[PDB]
Amino acid sequence: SMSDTMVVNGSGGVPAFLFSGSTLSSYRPNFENSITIALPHYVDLPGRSNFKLMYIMGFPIDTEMEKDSEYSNKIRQESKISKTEGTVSYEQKITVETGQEKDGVKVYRVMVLEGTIAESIEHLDKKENEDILNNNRNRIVLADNTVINFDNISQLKEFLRRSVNIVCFEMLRCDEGLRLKIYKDTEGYYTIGIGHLLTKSPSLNAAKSELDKAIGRNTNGVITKDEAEKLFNQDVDAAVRGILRNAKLKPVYDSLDAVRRCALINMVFQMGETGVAGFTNSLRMLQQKRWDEAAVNLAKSRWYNQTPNRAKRVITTFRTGTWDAYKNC
Amino acid sequence: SMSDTMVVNGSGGVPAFLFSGSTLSSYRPNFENSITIALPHYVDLPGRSNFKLMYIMGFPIDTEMEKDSEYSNKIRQESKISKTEGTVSYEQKITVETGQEKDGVKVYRVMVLEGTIAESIEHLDKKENEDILNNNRNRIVLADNTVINFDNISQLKEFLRRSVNIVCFEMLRCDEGLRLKIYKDTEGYYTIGIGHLLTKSPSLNAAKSELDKAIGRNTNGVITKDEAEKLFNQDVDAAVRGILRNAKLKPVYDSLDAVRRCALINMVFQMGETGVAGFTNSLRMLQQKRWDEAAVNLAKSRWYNQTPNRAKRVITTFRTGTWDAYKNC
Ligand code: NA
Ligand code: NA
Ligand code: NA
Ligand code: NA
Ligand code: NA
Ligand code: NA
Ligand code: NA
Ligand code: NA
């Protein structure tokens, strides 16, 4: 007929932009002739059940079908973990995929294959990955082969950041408290959650307006426990973003392990970025991993003199890289 | 190891730009679920032996392997047709492919699937196809499943144009002669081949310089029969290019069949583009397919009066759309 399609190019699809962008993967299959990389090659991911991958042009495609097949996976179970408020334990590897599904067939491009949460965060922020992530369904395939389906890409990125930032949550809760209703801090300012300053305005309505903006709903000044975690995530993200823009803080931050990063973030929560940036000598000792020397030097500061109990806890965290000071808080 | 590749994107390959550009194909397979178009689907091309295609994202891939396989073709035989000077009969459909081969494995993207030569010419000139054609090996798979391998894309395009233009060759040979050595035309000007004017200069050296430039070698004023065909192809191509830029000639040309196009090209060879563009009424009659009226009107012209024998032959070609006037020339 006249409407028959005679010319095909790369437009559309089904899923969209399927072979665009990049994939991060420590695993790299070894098949064999170089000129046949664009031909499909199938492999079972080492160490995993029901995890067959089809490679095309070096990219992995994860297909699931209800129909039994030697070339696709069985339909995977959905995880019970909340896509809105849940986390994945921060040390587990994850697989991040983007694609489409319908009528018992699922076709997903693998974007991160058994990567860390932090690797996943950086990878999904790459500009070359915007088109594929923004135009397809995004999911995580967990280490146990269950799946978390996300409503949109931002929800997935927020879940990832929540999973890494939660590592600092109980530490800051210990030091700053956790409140689910607006209260006044020791300076008279409206605050909620884990030391989250809403406004310096004496207007309670203004504080509620700020809270509603941060949470994204009409809270009437009351939040859930998970929303305290949401504000905390926003605050940690802001702190880290500022640290990385500050030539006095980036090198030390880049050098620290997760637990010690929490201690640096704790200092920023307490005294602000500029204040922490003033600790030139102690920061240098931390960057050089001179833990005992750093701890000794931090204790000689006005910070330590003003709040010695919290400072002792933070300093022990820098000295040891453990949660010893926060056990049973 | 530290050099291990952890990030893969679309760069390189193996063959290069394999899923770029567009494919022209009257045939369109019917598989089945929309979201699985990026998964490989295999089909045997209807009406052909040893012609299995692998479809990915709507594009066909033609693979050949020495190793026996249910998923690739047997190695195809090379055609005896000359890649430099040969042709394919102008009514045969052809398959144009671009790709790579080595060590008994061949992987080719199908660019035109059983298309006409004219369709192939237009398709391979599309800007979106430049990258894939310029960076891979180009071949034609003929209707008999034998293959013509081209040294580069220009050689393939020239072969295609030669195959369509040869249709006019014996007609113009009949009317203008064929000479393999430089001679002087009736106006004293150096000429060769099928009425190919080299220069109006009285310098034989200048004529040889022009000839060497057109042919692309040191000819010393002597060409082969196939080189007369090369000059003819260049002249037909130039004539057609001019016709399509001329608002007075394009509509009639667009409307004519192959044989009648040769008659219009014959007129341009004889009297130049501007001269042919003067035949407003006769061109209009041709465009409207009023063959008898056009033939009657063309015979009333000064052209007919000056060269009635050639004009009678050209006019019969416009009247009938046959080679009747050129049989046994
Ligand atoms: Na790893
Ligand atoms: Na690593
Ligand atoms: Na990894
Ligand atoms: Na210091
Ligand atoms: Na056709
Ligand atoms: Na057609
Ligand atoms: Na066709
Ligand atoms: Na006329």
The answer to whether residues A102 and A63 touch, using CB atoms and an 8 Å cutoff, is no
Distance from CA of B62 to the nearest CA of A (A): 11
Q: Which domain holds residue B4?
A: 1-165
Would you call the peptide bond into B167 cis, given omega within 30 degrees of 0 as the criterion?
Answer: no
Nearest CA in chain A to B106: A35
Q: Which residues pair with B61 in a beta bridge?
A: B54, B109
Identify whether residues B2 and B109 lie together within a single domain.
yes
| Helix B291-298 with B308-320: angle, nearest 10 deg | 170
| Chain A residues within an 8 Å CB radius of B101 | 35
Decide if B25 contacts B112 (C-beta within 8 A).
yes
Of B23, B57, B103, nearest to A33 by CB-CB distance is B103
Q: Give the sheet arrangement for strand B196-197, strand by strand.
A: B179-184, B190-193, B196-197
Report residue A193: phi and psi, to 5°.
Answer: 65, -135
Cis? peptide before B14, omega within 30° of 0:
yes
Shared domain check, B149 and B197: no
Q: What's the rounded Cα separation, in Å, for the pair A123 and A132?
A: 13
Supply φ then ψ for residue B220, to 5 degrees: 45, 35
Spatial CA neighbour of B69 closest among B104, B95, B38: B104
Of A140, A165, A190, the position where a domain reaches its end is: A165
Tally the C-alpha atoms within 13 A of residue B214's C-alpha that lie toward its C-beta.
27
Q: Domain count of chain A? A: 2
Q: How crowded is residue A102: how many other Cβ atoms within 10 Å of its Cβ?
A: 10
> What's chain A's Rg over C-alpha atoms?
24
State whether B58 and A8 contact (CB < 8 Å). Answer: yes
Instruction: Copy the structure tokens of residue B12.
Output: 């390189």
Report CA Rg, chain B.
24
For residues B12 and B268, what is the distance between their CA atoms, to the nearest angstrom?
47
φ/ψ (deg, to 5) at A268: -60, -45
Is residue A66 flagged as an active site residue? no
Same domain, A140 and A216: no
Cβ proximity of B97 and B138 under 8 Å:
yes
Separation CA B25–CA B112 (nearest Å):
6
Strands B137-141 and A59-65: unpaired
C-alpha distances in angstroms, A180 versus A141, A171, B113, B268?
33, 17, 67, 90
Tokens of A69: 């097949």
List, by residue number, the catalytic residues of B: 176, 185
Q: Report the run of H or E that residue A112 belongs to, with start and end.
A: strand A105-115
Q: CB–CB of A64/A72 below 8 Å?
A: yes
Cα B43 to Cα B30, B53, B60, B97, B220: the distances in Å are 10, 5, 10, 17, 54
Measured torsion, CA atoms of residues A268, A271, A277, A282, in degrees rounded to the nearest 10: -90
* Backbone φ, ψ for residue B112 (5° rounding): -135, 125
Chain B environment of A39 (Cβ under 8 Å): 54, 61, 63, 107
Instruction: Copy the structure tokens of residue A235.
Output: 């605050």
CA dihedral over A152, A153, A159, A162, signed as positive or negative: negative
Chain breaks in chain A (C to N over 2.5 A) after: 32
**Domain boundary residue among B165, B181, B209?**
B165
Task: Quote the CA–CA distance of A86 and A66 in Å, as a whole number.
Answer: 28
Q: Which of B213, B33, B14 is nearest to A38 (CA)?
A: B14
Are B269 and B153 members of one domain? no
- C-alpha distances out from residue A97 to A160, A295, B195, Å: 14, 43, 66
The full length of chain A comes to 329
Cited resolution, angstroms? 1.7
CA-based nearest residue to B291, from B261, B247, B321: B321
Residue A195's beta-bridge partner residues? Answer: none
Same domain membership, residue B160 and residue B274: no
**Rounded distance, CA B210 to CA B207, Å?**
5
- Distance between CA A300 and CA B162 in Å, rounded? 90
Are residue A107 and residue A238 in the same domain, yes or no?
Answer: no
Q: Are A199 and A192 in contact (CB under 8 A)?
A: no
The CA distance from B174 to B310, in Å, is: 9
- H-helix or E-strand containing A96? strand A94-102
Question: What technique solved it?
Answer: X-ray
Residues shown for chain B: 329
Q: How far is CA A174 from the centre of its chain?
A: 22
CATH code of the domain containing A315: 1.10.530.40
Rounded to whole angstroms, the Cα distance separating B77 from A162 reads 61
- The type of residue at A296 is V
The helix or strand, by DSSP H or E, that contains position A184, with its residue range, turns out to be strand A179-184
Cβ-Cβ contacts under 8 Å for A50 (sequence gap 6 or more): A73, A74, A76, A145
Determine whether the annotation assigns residue B297 to a binding site.
yes
User: Could you give the 3-state DSSP secondary structure of residue A328?
Assistant: coil
Separation of alpha carbons B9 and A59, rounded Å: 8
How far is Cα B130 from Cα A26, in angstroms, rounded to an integer?
35
Q: Which of A14, A21, A24 sits opposite B38 (nearest CB)?
A: A14
Same domain, A12 and A119: yes
Contact A310, A176 (CB under 8 A): no
Quote the CA–CA distance of B62 and B39 in Å, as a whole number.
16
Classify residue A75 as exposed, middle or buried by CB count within 10 Å of its CB (0-12, 13-18, 19+): middle
Give the DSSP letter of residue A30: -
The three-state (H, E, C) secondary structure of chain B, written as one string: CCCCCCEECCCCCCCCCCCCCCEEECCCCCCCCHHHCCCCEEEECCCCCCCEEEEECCEEEEEEECCCCCCCECCCCECCCCCCCCCCCCCCCEEEEEEEEECCEEEEEEEEEEECHHHHHHHHCCHHHHHHHHCCEEEEECCCCCEEEECCHHHHHHHHHHHHHHHHHHHHHHHHCCEEEEEECCCCCEEEECCEECCCCCCHHHHHHHHHHHHCCCCCCECCHHHHHHHHHHHHHHHHHHHHHCCCCHHHHHHCCHHHHHHHHHHHHHHCHHHHHCCHHHHHHHHCCCHHHHHHHHCCCHHHHHCHHHHHHHHHHHHHCCCHHHCCC
Are residue A74 and residue A188 in the same domain, yes or no? no
Question: Which residues of chain B are within 8 Å of residue A8 when distances are taken between CB atoms?
Answer: 22-23, 25, 58-59
Within this chain, do residues B161 and B172 fall inside the same structural domain, yes or no? Answer: no
- Are residues B327 and B303 both part of a single domain? yes
Cα A243 to middle of ligand 3, angstroms: 25
A268 contacts: CB under 8 Å, gap ≥ 6: A239, A242, A243, A276
Do A260 and A152 share a domain, yes or no? no
Q: At which of B115, B149, B165 does a domain end?
A: B165
Helix (H, G, I), strand (E, B) or coil at A322: coil
| Residue A304 sits in the same domain as residue A176 | yes
- Three-state DSSP at A181 gives strand
Please check whether residue B148 is in contact with residue B86, taking contact to mean a CB–CB distance below 8 angstroms. yes
- The whole-angstrom distance between A264's CA and the closest CA on chain B is 30
- Counting runs of H as helices and runs of E as strands, what totals does chain A give? 13, 12
In terms of CA atoms, which chain A residue is nearest residue B112? A7
Question: A68 forms bridges with which residues in the sheet?
Answer: none
Q: CA–CA separation, B270 vs B277, rounded Å?
A: 13
Amino acid in the structure at residue A173: R
